[PDB]
Design a protein around this ligand. Structure first.
Ligand SMILES: *[C@@H]1O[C@H](CO)[C@@H](O[C@@H]2O[C@H](CO)[C@@H](O)[C@H](O)[C@H]2NC(C)=O)[C@H](O)[C@H]1NC(C)=O
Ligand SMILES: *[C@@H]1O[C@H](CO)[C@@H](O)[C@H](O)[C@H]1NC(C)=O
Ligand SMILES: *[C@@H]1O[C@H](CO)[C@@H](O)[C@H](O)[C@H]1NC(C)=O
Ligand SMILES: *[C@@H]1O[C@H](CO)[C@@H](O)[C@H](O)[C@H]1NC(C)=O
Ligand SMILES: *[C@@H]1O[C@H](CO)[C@@H](O)[C@H](O)[C@H]1NC(C)=O
Ligand SMILES: *[C@@H]1O[C@H](CO)[C@@H](O)[C@H](O)[C@H]1NC(C)=O
Ligand SMILES: *[C@@H]1O[C@H](CO)[C@@H](O)[C@H](O)[C@H]1NC(C)=O
Ligand SMILES: *[C@@H]1O[C@H](CO)[C@@H](O)[C@H](O)[C@H]1NC(C)=O
Ligand SMILES: *[C@@H]1O[C@H](CO)[C@@H](O)[C@H](O)[C@H]1NC(C)=O
Ligand SMILES: *[C@@H]1O[C@H](CO)[C@@H](O)[C@H](O)[C@H]1NC(C)=O
Ligand SMILES: *[C@@H]1O[C@H](CO)[C@@H](O)[C@H](O)[C@H]1NC(C)=O
Ligand SMILES: *[C@@H]1O[C@H](CO)[C@@H](O)[C@H](O)[C@H]1NC(C)=O
Lengths: 282, 126, 382
């Protein structure tokens, strides 16, 4: 809970990549059998410029030590893609001022259950969880919960059932890709989510996937900025030997902003969107 | 001025199936914001709901054996409530109490749904 | 039907041919309503089926949200002396929606029940609890003598007897500093002009109703600019069947027939639609089975008859309707003597155009006289 000033930040210039035709969510769950439906709503334009963020830690001399956690505005919607193998990214934070004077939303995977809260959290300058490679018995487990110092006059709370996720570090090409879409239209906190196995390190595959509606949470807050929760492995516990010091497991995430666009979606016989055409594009 | 004191009057002997009126006068705070309820209690018996009228005088409600036969109305300027007994029955011989409860304009039947209680007026039906 | 045909043409005599007379439709039988299987209710048992409550001054606050509220139990068990709601239904609490609820649990005196009221003035209404001039909630108070009274006297509960200013609505004061009624500073000493603001009640089983303890729960409901977390059919809305009826499915009121559909849908189940943006299949909230929606009968009624001269008998044609549904096609209320013959009985033929009543099918084939349609023609000749 105590605030910690993360150090050893080798800043790098911002990077933009091509989103291809990735990211499309059902505006409303209405069955459609082999028909083309034109709908105007908040969508991510095809081949848009999506901001890249890395999570790695070189060993020898490069001194990357990159821990991405910006305060990127929220705008009218957010599309968040994350490629990883060990679930390095643990959650997200949304709010206007990110202080105790205004209500703020926090979603976090506590390594046992998913907790979604809306409270006047007192966010630190650099919110950051912490996972310790406890060599004592034999295991990896989460040790530090230092996202917010304190919370007062909270509004909403929800906790999922207990779970057992694999926090052990995995090496090789990325194996999991989770794509989510968040929006707050008409005071409705709509979250769509989808998961996909992959085999690569970068250059997301050329394909089309339909985001599915995960939840519609009741938040009437006026989100305008958001942050991401990153988990890093302790250094001196597993030397390492840096204090204050941390290392980031291989992970990456792309952040994009949605705009009002008209999309033509082809609903197959089974009712699953098979393809989408962006109106303006070309 | 701040306590809603209620006084009942008009009760008396009346022929069965005739016409009668009971007046409950409220003095104190704003009566227009107070829902009103008329209940009946026979000598040595419990209090039974008779009728209810809303603070804004929008709708009126009555119990099973008193609906239609009896009517309820209220005047905020006079801070008074008039309950009209029409087509009376011999079973209506009892003390009618008038209660004020600061509520909204919805159904209100149970005695527990009221706070105050008036002196009560005796009504006899032959 | 001949007379009806005459009225449509505004003539007392008609010639050979087929005339479209009117239209028929099947009305919904009685009603239909459906909704989900409901889930666990809000933790009201911990509010009313608990063991110990808090004091009047230190009233406990609970935030009820993100759960389904089953308010029937509040009035089903008539063990509560006082149960009064303002701005909300006492009885139909199961048909109201609110974003959040605040439960205020405490214990007061029987005489202080009068003090506990919206916009009321009194010791408790000023120094321990208060309600606004636009209170929206319920108050439920029931005697707790045996539950909150010791033989020698339950002095645990306390009430703020003294306070400089009256409490604002939905305000709590838990200050324990010695109250000063004069200009002499207490300096941590209790005595003259310095008394404890909180005083203890003499709750005893033998004490009168006024002095006996009463457990009180005040539930204040708020519906702000956010989706409501307490909504739906708290108790039940079920017992439906397949038939031409008007159905209320999760907000859609539609007239049709709820048959069974052998279609595979997506895991997360909600409403359906077709090419023309017209609903054609709605989910079953209870069982994971899909139901189609189709119009009941539509169609039109026409009269086939030769000229009034040389013949008077007539036949009826119902368009695009099965011959089994003709008897209920706007009937049971018309002139019984001379309408059932042309709607039921023998001489019923099922053609591509629909149902023909009053005409006897013949396997021969002559020149078309009155074109029924789809290669079928009606003639009066023997
Ligand atoms: C909705 O509630 C009903 C009521 O219990 C459930 O009915 C049971 O369904 C199971 C599954 O087929 C049967 O084995 C039981 O015999 C049924 N019991 C009764 C009393 O009907 C129904 O399964 C529930 N549906 C969902 C989707 O939860
Ligand atoms: C962390 O950094 C913030 C931003 O300046 C500062 O306010 C806070 O005191 C720091 N905390 C620690 C423990 O260094
Ligand atoms: C996307 O970003 C790249 C790299 O910064 C830049 O060269 C390109 O012009 C950008 N395109 C758009 C459409 O923003
Ligand atoms: C998450 O885990 C930390 C571990 O220290 C714990 O303190 C915190 O209460 C947990 N949050 C939950 C269960 O919501
Ligand atoms: C080892 O097991 C117990 C379980 O809590 C405890 O000693 C500790 O949390 C675990 N990890 C260590 C000791 O590094
Ligand atoms: C919490 O803050 C909101 C801000 O709008 C306010 O309305 C509410 O009364 C506060 N609640 C408490 C318990 O202070
Ligand atoms: C509250 O929402 C409005 C949208 O109408 C927005 O303009 C405002 O900035 C929001 N409040 C804060 C503190 O961001
Ligand atoms: C549609 O669903 C059926 C039934 O599960 C399945 O056999 C088929 O592969 C799916 N896809 C298409 C294109 O039919
Ligand atoms: C026991 O629980 C029920 C809820 O079903 C509640 O109505 C009742 O009041 C509880 N018992 C007591 C003594 O209040
Ligand atoms: C009746 O109709 C028949 C057949 O067209 C015709 O031969 C006859 O003259 C008609 N008679 C009268 C009185 O109209
Ligand atoms: C009429 O209903 C019967 C069964 O009741 C069915 O066999 C027949 O195909 C139906 N005909 C039409 C035209 O719908
Ligand atoms: C017409 O022929 C069919 C086919 O054999 C037969 O079933 C039917 O009874 C015949 N109808 C008449 C009126 O001869």
């Amino acid at each position: 809970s105590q605030c910690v000033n993360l150090t050893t930040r080798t800043q790098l210039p911002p990077a933009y990549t091509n989103s291809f035709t990735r990211g499309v969510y059902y505006p409303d769950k209405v069955f459609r059998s082999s028909v083309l439906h034109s709908t105007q709503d908040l969508f991510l334009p095809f081949f848009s410029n999506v901001t890249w963020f890395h999570a790695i830690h070189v060993s020898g001399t490069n001194g990357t030590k990159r821990f991405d956690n910006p305060v990127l505005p929220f705008n009218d919607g957010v599309y968040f893609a994350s490629t990883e193998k060990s679930n390095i990214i643990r959650g997200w934070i949304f709010g206007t001022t990110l202080d105790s004077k205004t209500q703020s939303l926090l979603i976090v995977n506590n390594a046992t259950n998913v907790v979604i809260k809306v409270c006047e959290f007192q966010f630190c300058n650099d919110p950051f969880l912490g996972v310790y490679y406890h060599k004592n018995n034999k295991s990896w487990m989460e040790s530090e919960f230092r996202v917010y110092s304190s919370a007062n006059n909270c509004t909403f709370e929800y906790v999922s059932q207990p779970f057992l996720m694999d926090l052990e570090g995995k090496q090789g090409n990325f194996k999991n890709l989770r794509e989510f879409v968040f929006k707050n239209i008409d005071g409705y906190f709509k979250i769509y989510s989808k998961h996909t196995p992959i085999n690569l390190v970068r250059d997301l595959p050329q394909g089309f996937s339909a985001l599915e509606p995960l939840v519609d949470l009741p938040i009437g807050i006026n989100i305008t900025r958001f942050q991401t929760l990153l988990a890093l492995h302790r250094s001196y516990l597993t030397p390492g030997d840096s204090s204050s010091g941390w290392t980031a497991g291989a992970a990456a995430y792309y952040v994009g902003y949605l705009q009002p666009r008209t999309f033509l979606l082809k609903y197959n016989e089974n009712g699953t969107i098979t393809d989408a055409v962006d109106c303006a594009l070309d | 001025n701040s306590q809603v004191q209620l006084v009942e009057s008009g009760g008396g002997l009346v022929q069965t199936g005739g016409s009668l009126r009971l007046s409950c006068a409220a003095s104190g705070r704003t009566f227009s914001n107070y829902v009103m309820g008329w209940f009946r209690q026979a000598p040595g018996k419990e209090r039974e709901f008779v009728s209810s009228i809303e603070w804004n005088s929008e709708n009126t409600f009555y119990a099973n054996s008193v609906k239609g036969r009896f009517t309820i109305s209220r005047d905020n300027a006079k801070n008074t409530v008039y309950l009209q007994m029409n087509s009376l029955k011999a079973e209506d011989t009892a003390v009618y109490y008038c209660a004020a409860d600061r509520g909204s304009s919805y159904y209100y039947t149970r005695a527990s749904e009221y706070t105050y209680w008036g002196q009560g007026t005796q009504v006899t039906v032959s | 039907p001949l007379s009806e045909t005459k009225c449509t043409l505004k003539s007392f005599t008609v010639e050979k041919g087929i005339y479209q007379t009117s239209n028929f439709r099947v009305q919904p039988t009685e009603s239909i309503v459906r909704f989900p299987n409901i889930t666990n209710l809000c933790p009201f048992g911990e509010v009313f089926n608990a063991t110990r409550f808090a004091s009047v001054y230190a009233w406990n606050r609970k935030r009820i949200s993100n759960c389904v509220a089953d308010y029937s139990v509040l009035y089903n068990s008539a063990s509560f002396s006082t149960f009064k709601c303002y701005g909300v239904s006492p009885t139909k609490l199961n048909d109201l929606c609110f974003t959040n609820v605040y439960a205020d649990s405490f214990v007061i005196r029987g005489d202080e029940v009068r003090q506990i009221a919206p916009g009321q003035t009194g010791k408790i209404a000023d120094y321990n609890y208060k309600l606004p001039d636009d209170f929206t909630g319920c108050v439920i108070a029931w005697n707790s003598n045996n539950l909150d009274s010791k033989v020698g006297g339950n002095y645990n509960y306390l009430y703020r007897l003294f306070r400089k200013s009256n409490l604002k609505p939905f305000e709590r004061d838990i200050s324990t500093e010695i109250y000063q009624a004069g200009s002499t500073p207490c300096n941590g000493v209790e005595g003259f002009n310095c008394y404890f603001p909180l005083q203890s009640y003499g709750f005893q089983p033998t004490n009168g109703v006024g002095y006996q303890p009463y457990r009180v729960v005040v539930l204040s409901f708020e519906l702000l600019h956010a989706p409501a977390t307490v909504c739906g059919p708290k108790k039940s809305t079920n017992l439906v069947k397949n038939k031409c009826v008007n159905f209320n499915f999760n907000g859609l009121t539609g007239t049709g027939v709820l048959t069974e559909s052998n279609k595979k849908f997506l895991p997360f189940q909600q409403f359906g639609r077709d090419i023309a943006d017209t609903t054609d299949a709605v989910r079953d909230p209870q069982t994971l089975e899909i139901l189609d929606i189709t119009p009941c009968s539509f169609g039109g009624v026409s009269v086939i008859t030769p000229g009034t001269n040389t013949s008077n008998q007539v036949a009826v044609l119902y368009q695009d309707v099965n011959c089994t549904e003709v008897p209920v096609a706007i009937h049971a209320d018309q002139l019984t003597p001379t309408w059932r013959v042309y709607s039921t009985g023998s001489n019923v033929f099922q053609t591509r155009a629909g149902c023909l009543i009053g005409a006897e099918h013949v396997n021969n084939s002559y020149e078309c006289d009155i074109p029924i349609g789809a290669g079928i023609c009606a003639s009066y000749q023997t």
